[PDB]
RNA sequence: GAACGCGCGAUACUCUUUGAACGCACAUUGCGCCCCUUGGUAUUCCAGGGGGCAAGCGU
RNA sequence: AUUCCCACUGUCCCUAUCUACUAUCUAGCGAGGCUGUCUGAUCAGGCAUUGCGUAAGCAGUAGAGUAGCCGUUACGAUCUGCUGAGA
RNA sequence: AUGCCUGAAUAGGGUGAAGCCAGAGGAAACUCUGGUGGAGGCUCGCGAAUUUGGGUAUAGUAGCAAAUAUUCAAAUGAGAACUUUGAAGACUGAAGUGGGGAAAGGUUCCACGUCAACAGCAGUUGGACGUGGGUUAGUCGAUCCUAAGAGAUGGUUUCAAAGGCCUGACAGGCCACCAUCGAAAGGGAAUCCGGUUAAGAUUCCGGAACCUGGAUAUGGAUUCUUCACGGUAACGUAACUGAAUGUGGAGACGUCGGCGCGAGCCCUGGGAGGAGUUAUCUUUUCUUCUUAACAGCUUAUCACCCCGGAAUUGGUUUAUCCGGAGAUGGGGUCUUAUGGCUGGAAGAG
């Protein structure tokens, strides 16, 4: 059970990192648009 | 095989790495 | 059927590969319980940022 | 089930010497050294393989005709078609913009 | 080696100044219909190549043999 | 002084390859250039032989 | 790492036997069955550091099953008899 | 201890990470189930360690020299356990006790004669002794080039007068930048098959073929007289001038995984031969049935071009990637890697 937990919080960290980098990419492309 | 033939003296004293002779000092 | 590369590696490189694996395992086991072996990221996390350091000094 | 080896001085598995096995008219398996394959010429702007140009070794080009290593279009044998089209369009638009800038400048110092 | 399908080209090859000998080779071989036949190869070497003419017709081979120069050496098989 | 050969050096009981060693390299009998000449179809090619190559914004 | 429970053991009571190797001298010199595998298959054998009591053959209408018809070809493990036989 | 340049090697078994597909629960986030996918400080056979070649930096006693299995007949010879032939038994078992190479060795290769010494018994044997024979290249290497680095010139291009070329019925002009060494595993123009000796082979012989350099001749083209055409296009061609100057490609470049294709080997059916076994059974067990470099015709995934304008979103890989920055669809262009037919070539084997 503890292993499955630590796995799901690892998934949480990975998804948050990917979402953050995607949002940053969109934000930095917005400036280059104009 | 640290030494080879020396042209000036004919001995097996020509150091291949140093390119110098330990018997007649060539060149 | 065994491949040629497998035969060559097992005839040539297996012994020293196994020995190095054993040595690495032994060293890791020995330094697992020692105190003072940390990664650079962990050292930075323990150190904290600048603002955390003025907070600690206060 | 007959074993063959190199036929030249190099005894090592280097890219220079590579071996194929063929059955000779004598009924035996023998080794044959294979040369390096040729590389298609590439466009000088985008790096894609040029179309309609023969793929040969560097010294084998001197023994074929010009139609086997060129294309009848301008820059043929050096640049592909899309790169040439882009060059033409860009040059024309640059010249037109130069004309427009010169006219605007002639207007703006025409005030004094 | 080169193959030629032209009879007059072969005759022109055999008519040059530097011609040594012509070889006539016979092969007993079967065709796709299954009936065996006689195939004749006329070989002459030019400057740097050996030109071969393959004829699967008996009468044409006989006519070409009769049309060869009388001062030309011919190897039978 | 050394190497290879028949005391001597292809003229071998004139002086090969070298060596302070000298066209350049060199643990290779490797790579050049210049002048004359000869031969093989020959103005072009190829080869052999001989002999060589360590000016000024000054007065 | 230590201590108790059960089971086993030549550790021991208490030694004994076999195989291999070794040691010695001489010539010269000289400080019946089973597993795996192979002989084309049976039969009969080889190898795997002993690898770990009913013969071969024939017959039966008895015989798991394979293979012919809607009383019936053939093959056939196993079993029974020749057979306390064979060696 | 830390390096640098150029090569070889970085294998296998197991497990199964992101991502993706189809389902179920939930308003999302998400969480389970099956598959797919094939990743790692995953496993298996301040410290230590971290494959490898070449180059290059900072008493007749101890004992028998230890690698198992030998036996029978014949030959030679003065002499045979040790030499030779045949038969039997046994061994290496493609990761060899089998065939080659770099380095290194230098005649140890082959033949004839011999056993004084040597091969720790013997020997008629020999990697021994004595005498001879043997190594053949335009295509294989070196030779050429540069790598790390080394090293002249006045420390490696530096307050150096450092060199070549061009024009013109001696003057003018152009350009910049340093020798050389350093790899028989890096880059590189080109040869294959068959046969042949006591000992030589991609080198010799026979046949067949390519590469580079050079001088030249002929045909054809260069179409009114002067450097050619076709297709919308990708592009095609028997040609189809091109100085200074400025560029581009090949050479020329990390490692791993699955998928597709070709070739060699392995497996296998029929048939044409030869060999073995057969008291009984066994259409049975073994072996031959091959096609070189080179050359002509033809043959492509990818990529690109033209038409066209797509949501009811389609196409599509084992791997979820692609499309108004133009998909699906229809029709074309190209590289010839690699197959097929043919010549070489059946005359060979
Ligand atoms: Zn391009």
Q: What is the DSSP string of chain D?
A: ------SSS--S--SS--EEEEE-TTS-EEEEEPPPPP---B-TTT-PBPTT-----GGGGGGS-GGGS--SSTTTTTS-HHHHHHHHHHHHHHHHHHHHHHHHHHHHTS--
Chain-centroid distance of CA E71 in Å reads: 16
Residue D100: burial class (beta carbons within 10 Å; 0-12, 13-18, 19+): exposed
Rounded Cα distance between E20 and D24, Å, is: 30
Give the distance, in angstroms, between residue D68 CA and nucleotide G35 C1': 73
The sign one gets for the Cα dihedral C45, C47, C51, C57 is positive
CB proximity B26–strand F (7 Å threshold): yes
Query: Residues of B marked as binding for Zn(2+)?
Result: 6, 9, 21, 24
B17 strand F contact, CB < 7 Å: no
Radius of gyration in angstroms for the set of CA atoms belonging to chain B, rounded to a whole number: 7
Beta-bridged to residue E38, according to DSSP, are E28
Please name the residue that has the structure tokens 């040969």. D56
Contacts of residue E41, defined as CB under 8 A and 6 or more positions apart, other chains included, come to E23, E24, E25, E27, E52, E53, E54, E55
Label residue E53 exposed, middle or buried (CB < 10 Å: 0-12, 13-18, 19+): buried
Q: How far is the CA of D47 from the centre of ligand 1 (A)?
A: 6
CA angle C36–C16–C6, rounded 5-degree value: 125
Could you tell me if E50 and E43 are in contact, meaning their C-beta atoms sit under 8 angstroms apart?
yes
Residues 6+ apart with CB under 8 A from E67: E11
For E34: left if phi > 0, alpha if psi spans -120 to 50, otherwise beta; the answer is left
Technique of determination: cryo-EM
Q: Which residues contact D16 (CB under 8 A, 6 or more apart)?
A: D10
- Provide the resolution (angstroms): 3.0
Asked if residue B8 keeps its beta carbon closer than 7 A to nucleic acid strand F, the reply is yes
Q: Which residue is nearest to nucleotide H51 (CA to C1')?
A: C13
């Amino acid at each position: 059970e503890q292993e499955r937990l630590r796995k799901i919080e690892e998934r949480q960290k990975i998804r948050q990192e990917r979402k953050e980098v995607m949002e940053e990419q969109l934000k930095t492309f917005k400036e280059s648009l104009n | 095989k640290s030494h080879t033939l020396c042209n000036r003296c004919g001995r097996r004293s020509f150091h291949v790495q140093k390119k110098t002779c330990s018997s007649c000092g060539y060149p | 059927k065994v491949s040629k590369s497998t035969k060559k590696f097992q005839s040539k490189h297996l012994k020293h590969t196994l020995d190095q694996r054993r040595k690495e395992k032994i060293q890791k086991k020995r330094i697992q319980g020692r105190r003072g072996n940390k990664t650079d990221q962990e050292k930075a996390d323990a150190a904290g940022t600048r603002e955390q350091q003025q907070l600690k000094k206060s | 089930a007959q074993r063959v080896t190199f036929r030249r001085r190099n005894p090592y598995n280097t890219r220079s010497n590579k071996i194929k096995v063929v059955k000779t008219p004598g009924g035996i398996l023998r080794a044959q050294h294979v040369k390096k394959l040729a590389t298609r010429p590439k466009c000088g702007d985008c790096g894609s393989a040029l179309q309609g140009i023969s793929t040969l070794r560097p010294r084998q080009y001197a023994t074929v005709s010009k139609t086997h290593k060129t294309v009848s279009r301008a820059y043929g044998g050096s640049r592909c078609a899309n790169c040439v089209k882009e060059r033409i369009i860009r040059a024309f638009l640059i010249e037109e913009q130069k004309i427009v800038k010169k006219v605007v400048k002639e207007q703006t110092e025409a005030a004094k | 080696a080169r193959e030629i399908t032209d009879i007059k080209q072969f005759l022109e090859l055999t008519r040059r100044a530097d011609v040594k000998t012509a070889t006539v080779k016979i092969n007993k071989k079967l065709n796709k219909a299954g009936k065996p036949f006689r195939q004749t190869k006329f070989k002459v070497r030019g400057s740097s190549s050996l030109y071969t003419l393959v004829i699967n017709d008996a009468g044409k081979a006989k006519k070409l043999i009769q049309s060869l120069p009388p001062t030309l050496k011919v190897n039978r098989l």
